[PDB]
């Protein structure tokens, strides 16, 4: 966390700084997207 890295989560991959936030996704919904239709957050595929 808190570093520039290339991450691969489940079937998604990308580069960016990963920081745990207070956002809460619905129970079964892992991947989000912003107003630009680009993922701004991802839920930990393993932990919650």
């Amino acid at each position: 966390k808190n570093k520039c890295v290339n991450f691969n989560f489940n079937g998604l991959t990308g580069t960016g700084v990963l920081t745990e936030s207070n956002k809460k996704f619905l129970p079964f919904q892992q991947f989000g997207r912003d107003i630009a239709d680009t993922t701004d957050a991802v839920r930990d595929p393993q932990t919650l």
């Binding site: 912003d34 107003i35 630009a36 680009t38 701004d40």
Partner: peptide, 28 residues
């Protein structure tokens, strides 16, 4: 007269701050 720039600033579009701040403009 009214994040939005948060998403767009990440796409590679950078919003440059104005050389003249709104605080000094009020003093004009």
């Amino acid at each position: 007269v009214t994040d939005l720039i948060c998403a767009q600033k990440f796409n590679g579009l950078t919003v440059l701050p104005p050389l003249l701040t709104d605080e000094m403009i009020a003093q004009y």
